[PDB]
Design a protein around this ligand. Sequence first.
Ligand SMILES: CCCCCCCCCCCCCCCCCC(=O)OC[C@H](COP(=O)([O-])OCC(O)COP(=O)([O-])OC[C@@H](COC(=O)CCCCCCCCCCCCCCCCC)OC(=O)CCCCCCCCCCCCCCCCC)OC(=O)CCCCCCCCCCCCCCCCC
Ligand SMILES: CCCCCCCCCCCCCCCCCC(=O)OC[C@H](COP(=O)([O-])OC[C@H](O)COP(=O)([O-])OC[C@H](COC(=O)CCCCCCCCCCCCCCCCC)OC(=O)CCCCCCCCCCCCCCCCC)OC(=O)CCCCCCCCCCCCCCCCC
Ligand SMILES: CCCCCCCCCCCCCCCCCC(=O)OC[C@H](COP(=O)([O-])OCC[N+](C)(C)C)OC(=O)CCCCCCCCCCCCCCCCC
Ligand SMILES: CCCCCCCCCCCCCCCCCC(=O)OC[C@H](COP(=O)([O-])OCC[N+](C)(C)C)OC(=O)CCCCCCCCCCCCCCCCC
Ligand SMILES: CCCCCCCCCCCCCCCCCC(=O)OC[C@H](COP(=O)([O-])OCC[N+](C)(C)C)OC(=O)CCCCCCCCCCCCCCCCC
Lengths: 120, 63, 171, 65, 50, 331, 31, 100, 459
Amino acid sequence: MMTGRQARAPLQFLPDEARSLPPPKLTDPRLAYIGFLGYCSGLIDNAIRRRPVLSAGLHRQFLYITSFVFVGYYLLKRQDYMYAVRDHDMFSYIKSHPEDFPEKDKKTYREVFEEFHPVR
Amino acid sequence: DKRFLKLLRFYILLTGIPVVIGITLINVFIGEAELAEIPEGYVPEHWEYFKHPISRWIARTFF
Amino acid sequence: SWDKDVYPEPPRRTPAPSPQTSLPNPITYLTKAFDLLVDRPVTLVREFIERQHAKNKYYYYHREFRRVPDITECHEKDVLCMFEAEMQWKRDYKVDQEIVNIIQERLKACQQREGESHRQNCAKELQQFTQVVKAYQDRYHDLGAHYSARKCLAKQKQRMLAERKATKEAA
Amino acid sequence: LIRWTCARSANVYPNFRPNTKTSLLGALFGIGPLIFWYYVFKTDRDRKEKLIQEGKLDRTFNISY
Amino acid sequence: RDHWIHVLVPVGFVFGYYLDRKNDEKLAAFRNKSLLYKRELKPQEEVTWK
Amino acid sequence: MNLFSSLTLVTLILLTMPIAAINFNTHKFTNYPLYVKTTISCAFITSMIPTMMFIHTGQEMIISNWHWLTIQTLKLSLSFKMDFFSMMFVPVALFVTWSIMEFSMWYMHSDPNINQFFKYLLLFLITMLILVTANNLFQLFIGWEGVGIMSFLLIGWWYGRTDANTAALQAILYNRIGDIGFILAMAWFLINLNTWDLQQIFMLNPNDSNLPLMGLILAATGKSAQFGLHPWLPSAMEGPTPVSALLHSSTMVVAGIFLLIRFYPLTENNKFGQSIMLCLGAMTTLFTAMCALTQNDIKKIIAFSTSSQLGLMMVTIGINQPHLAFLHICT
Amino acid sequence: ITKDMLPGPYPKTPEERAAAAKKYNMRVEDY
Amino acid sequence: LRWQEDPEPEDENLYEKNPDSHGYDKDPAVDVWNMRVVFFFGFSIVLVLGSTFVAYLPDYRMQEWARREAERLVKYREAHGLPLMESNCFDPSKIQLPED
Amino acid sequence: MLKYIIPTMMLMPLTWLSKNSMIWINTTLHSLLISLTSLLLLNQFGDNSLNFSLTFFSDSLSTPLLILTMWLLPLMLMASQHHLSKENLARKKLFISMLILLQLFLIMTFTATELIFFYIMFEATLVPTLIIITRWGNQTERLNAGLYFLFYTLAGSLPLLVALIYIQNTMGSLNFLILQYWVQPMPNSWSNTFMWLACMMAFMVKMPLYGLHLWLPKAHVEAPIAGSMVLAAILLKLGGYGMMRITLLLNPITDFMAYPFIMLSLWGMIMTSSICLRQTDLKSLIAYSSVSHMALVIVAILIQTPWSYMGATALMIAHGLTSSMLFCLANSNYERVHSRTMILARGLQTLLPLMAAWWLLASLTNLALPPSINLIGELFVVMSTFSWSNITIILMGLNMVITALYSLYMLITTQRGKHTHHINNILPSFTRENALMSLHMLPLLLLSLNPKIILGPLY
Ligand SMILES: CCCCCCCCCCCCCCCCCC(=O)OC[C@H](COP(=O)([O-])OCC(O)COP(=O)([O-])OC[C@@H](COC(=O)CCCCCCCCCCCCCCCCC)OC(=O)CCCCCCCCCCCCCCCCC)OC(=O)CCCCCCCCCCCCCCCCC
Ligand SMILES: CCCCCCCCCCCCCCCCCC(=O)OC[C@H](COP(=O)([O-])OC[C@H](O)COP(=O)([O-])OC[C@H](COC(=O)CCCCCCCCCCCCCCCCC)OC(=O)CCCCCCCCCCCCCCCCC)OC(=O)CCCCCCCCCCCCCCCCC
Ligand SMILES: CCCCCCCCCCCCCCCCCC(=O)OC[C@H](COP(=O)([O-])OCC[N+](C)(C)C)OC(=O)CCCCCCCCCCCCCCCCC
Ligand SMILES: CCCCCCCCCCCCCCCCCC(=O)OC[C@H](COP(=O)([O-])OCC[N+](C)(C)C)OC(=O)CCCCCCCCCCCCCCCCC
Ligand SMILES: CCCCCCCCCCCCCCCCCC(=O)OC[C@H](COP(=O)([O-])OCC[N+](C)(C)C)OC(=O)CCCCCCCCCCCCCCCCC
């Protein structure tokens, strides 16, 4: 849908204007969930090779957690960037086309007549 | 059957008798609140709109 | 106690004891025994408990809700105003429910207190009961289990259109 | 007993054959009373709603519903 | 601790309770701004609820 | 007011006390049947004081002591109605039950479940005095289904016997067929009068009372063993003799008659209900007394006797004489 | 319990009828 | 013949090796402590303090207030001659109707 | 609601880090602590629901279902620990994990502020249930039963997915709190007709509806005891919860769309109850009783009057407790005779008197003996359906005869009569089994003292 937006600057994971946006905190619940996925990957890696699941390879489990947090941080940054680009294009388009977005007359319910349907 | 019923009555009464004694001591000594008109400028807390002390304690502590 | 105006009671006209017989009824002896053996120790324990209440006085309050704008002057699909209108409407619906409960308690107390002359002597409470049940029915009946201030306003507008058409066709 | 409880439950469908008799008894006893009670309750509620909306049915103290 | 496993579920309550309070401050836009419960602030008080 | 209402509630709480005793036990008793018999003798002595001070002035009241549940306009409360009917029926039921239990201290003496038997019999008495002292239809329905379930548990006393379990499930079957009409009456009063309390039922005084009175007559047919729903009462002799003496002669089986007596302001204005009750009670008192002419089992003969007397009670309700019917119950 | 002591299809040959009667523990002329 | 299968293990009786068994476990110390945990945190904690908590709920769904508030409003409108309830839920001065 | 979701998830380390003999006691203890903590959800108001966040809220409908759900886990752990005692420790921990995970999905199914999250959790509850039935069920037919349970629910609910996403595209939101105020009346069209069916038939299957209920006398019977407890006591009531949420959006079309389904329930409770009169499998008799009781909840939600919703949620809580206890009683005899034939073990009051008294109380609450909340829900639904149509009382009243008839026949077949001679492994009742019966029945009888907490959002 937005393929013409990211075509003037192709193959940029995070563009320069992405730095205008606030990055996710390191205590992001999504980033904590991806770290939990790293912990689950470490436990499954010890379970498939018949290792003590909590004991064997604390260095390996720690690299699983670290690698998934590291990849997921940049994935969350790009995610927040692309939703901000979506909203920026939306708001610029509504501002540039006022005739396609008229201000509606908000009527209170003293004028608004709804048909009543009795439940009996 | 008799062992289950003795254990049932014992583990019910083990906190039942302290709760009944404590509720009686609240209803006598701490006592129940009286209805009053709201003073001008006084903002009551949300637990000050309930009558029994345990109801006030629940509205102050948890709810 | 309570308020005697919301719960009305006529004054007690009890007749004087005029015994004709010489045999003493057991009710006087058992009433004196109930006064001596039962009512006085219960009164003493209640006075002890009342002193223990008086040793620490503290108050609870009746929560007053100020009036917020109702559903008629809330904009359509504006949840911040019509939410407050809906909460006001639901509290008013629960209070009107308890109004009908108070008038039912008046009706039942009148019937039992009058006894066999209830059909004559409780015409006023019956009239008040019929009025408040007619008002509660025109206000809240047939809204369904998903009732709202929108449903109630739509029922009110349908009833007002029916009343206006009935007045217009008869003039 | 095991043979009886297996015959009452498990062996019914593998020894079912849809033929004229089973079809007429399944359509007479299955969707028959559904149609019956449908027309009874539909006719009664059409009658009751017609009496209520015309101001005929005594609904004087009816405020619980 | 000799019995460290009996504090997984209670602290998981307490921490969870904490997060609920931690979410309440994120939903505090209409604090003392509702048309029903708005009022002047009492002395030595900054928020109506926490 | 302070004597009447207190001894009224003291009667019922006193009857509930040996249930707490048998539920909170550890030991082998010092004659728990003697304890229950002493309790019911004391309850009769206690309940005579409100009856005597009703004979003096006609003093009636209502103890709506505990609010239970408000369904939006229906404030169900724990409400006891002390009128003519409760004041006359509670001492009679307590005196008869005291005689039945001193009978049972001899008759059921060889039974190793004698404490369970006196427990069930006291539970029957508690449910029946809940029934007759009730002020609304929900509490009367509690007492109604309670005496039905204790009838089940006491017909099927010797539960290894197939015929006792069969007669107990038969009694439940006919009573629930009556309960159809009882719940029909409750439904009509809630939908058209917004009440289960008897006072608002009496004060509103409905005219279109064909359908709720048909429901109440069906309930009395099921509970007081009228024609069409009669055979459960001769089947009910399969339980022990004091079960037949207390429940199935004098106390439980008059509850449908008591139900139609309790709604006498609705039957004294409905001639159609009076004619239906008259024809049904005459049919029952003919048929059951005719069946009793040729029976050889003595409990079956006295069971058809009491069902014929219930038919006569239905007759004298149907001639718009409800107080004669209640006097005939107490007699 | 095993498979050929459980109920099966309708018997159509007389030897299957005899096997059914042997299964249900009753005579073939009574089955 | 059919395959190599272990036979059906017989039903064990907990009352043989543990005649004081509560049925929670075959080890008697684990069994009795399971009984104590079930009865304390089931009956002494959840049932007793749960009934105390539900018994003293602070005006559950504000029904008691709603009586007391009604006892205010009736007291306002008995004396002031007003009817006890209007059939109009909202003021007809603030309702526009579709003209016809 | 995050003060409940996090302890339920901390039950996973509490069962996987426990000592091999402590994995039942610890999970029982801390699940009872969570069930005691569940009472904080009773902060309900007469106007506003207890609204926690953008994701979770809890009104007076979801609150009793939540308290019942968090209470049911310790009872399932007590029920299922005997027959899984010879099980491997890893599969024992996996079974406890599936129960904990199912509770976890249920507590955020009932508190879903938004309806597609309700759908995700509502269909997430399939997978632990499916694994419990098709893995720890006893007989051969657990696999086929899991197939029927999976594919009736998914075939009903994948149109519900399209319908909910259509509401998200049309109304703009699937928040229930928003749709309380942005609900539009649904007019008469074929498009709105299949809108109604796609919103309703998933919950019709989960209740179950008569004719669509074929999964249930296989899924409830072929399950283990914990599976049958959670399927009868909670997982049927997801359908009633979801109907009470989703009929907000289906007015006034429900007023003429409910007419066939009401018939299917008003006849279905006559049929299934009658089926209970001829069931040789006791667990299937309890299953068809569950269908017969949930037919009233379907009728009460489809007539959508306030008395009907109060009675329907009271009937849901009451039937959860009663049906869970009846399945546990049937298990208490299955662990002594190793068969589910009801005519096999007889005369059990001669051998097990207190357990016969628990059977007696569960049968009296099954037949709606007043003042139980069974009778409160039953009676209020009967009141509202008498207001709906005055002839329905016949179909109600005859049902209340037949509901008595199999409730006592179950008591007379199993507990009364002459005991079976050849069955001699009838052990005395364990303290665990009577604890299970008492923890079912004592909350059920205490709720008769204060029933207003189980009467829903419109008390
Ligand atoms: C005793 C031990 C029993 C067993 C214990 C263990 C039980 C098992 C475990 C239980 C665990 C707890 C479970 C949760 C319960 C939580 C509490 C609760 O919900 O309380 C609710 C409720 C309200 O309590 P609240 O909100 O705290 O108090 C509200 C007040 O406004 C504010 O309170 P207040 O300040 O106004 O109240 C004053 C009260 C303090 O407050 C209390 O005690 C209330 C709290 C008691 C709670 C008890 C709950 C346990 C269950 C009791 C019932 C079942 C027991 C077993 C079965 C018994 C047989 C049936 O003061 C007194 O008690 C003193 C008065 C004593 C009068 C008698 C003696 C007078 C003469 C003395 C002569 C000698 C001295 C002379 C000179 C003196 C000079 C100084 O309390 C009760 O229901 C109390 C029980 C009595 C009620 C009336 C009973 C008679 C009714 C008869 C007619 C109706 C029935 C008709 C039946 C018909 C046939 C079927
Ligand atoms: C908040 C504080 C509350 C305090 C008060 C609590 C109120 C009661 C709550 C529920 C009580 C259930 C427990 C007893 C039955 C289950 C166990 C059993 O069978 O034990 C036998 C055993 C004595 O017998 P056994 O000889 O040793 O062995 C039995 C034999 O093997 C052979 O057995 P069996 O068949 O010969 O004996 C069983 C017999 C069999 O009899 C029957 O099945 C007949 C019952 C039905 C017909 C009669 C009643 C009809 C309805 C009228 C009553 C309600 C309304 C009355 C109000 C006024 C009118 C509106 O039943 C009874 O004796 C029970 C009498 C009371 C029945 C209550 C209604 C249950 C019927 C089913 C549901 C009906 C609707 C719901 C009613 C809810 C009421 C609260 O009892 C005990 O060991 C009792 C242990 C302690 C029980 C504590 C119960 C409360 C626990 C709650 C804890 C948390 C709150 C703290 C309060 C603690 C209070 C102490
Ligand atoms: C052996 C021990 C006995 C008790 C020992 C302790 C007490 C000692 C004696 C001193 C008295 C203590 C003080 C007085 C008691 C408290 C007074 C008080 O205000 O209590 C609060 C209230 C009084 O009612 P209320 O109206 O104030 O509160 C009801 C609550 N609302 C309003 C929210 C609905 O409760 C009680 O009194 C509770 C006990 C009631 C007694 C009867 C119980 C019957 C149970 C039946 C269950 C099923 C019924 C279903 C059908 C109902 C009918 C349709
Ligand atoms: C809830 C949904 C999920 C269901 C499963 C729940 C699992 C979790 C369980 C947690 C614990 C239980 C929670 C529910 C508790 C309900 C009980 C409760 O709190 O009640 C409050 C009710 C409150 O009554 P109330 O409505 O009057 O309230 C008064 C309010 N206050 C106290 C503030 C003034 O408590 C009582 O009624 C106590 C009264 C005294 C004790 C009882 C006396 C009568 C009982 C019968 C006695 C014998 C009568 C005769 C019988 C003869 C033989 C037949
Ligand atoms: C468990 C087994 C039984 C499950 C039953 C499930 C429900 C039965 C009915 C489902 C119909 C399909 C989903 C409809 C979703 C409607 C959403 C919507 O916006 O509708 C309006 C829309 C209308 O389009 P629109 O809304 O874009 O139009 C704009 C508005 N107007 C009309 C004014 C122009 O409906 C449709 O587009 C089509 C609806 C019917 C679809 C028919 C195809 C499916 C056939 C039935 C399949 C049933 C399950 C199959 C599996 C059975 C078991 C194997």
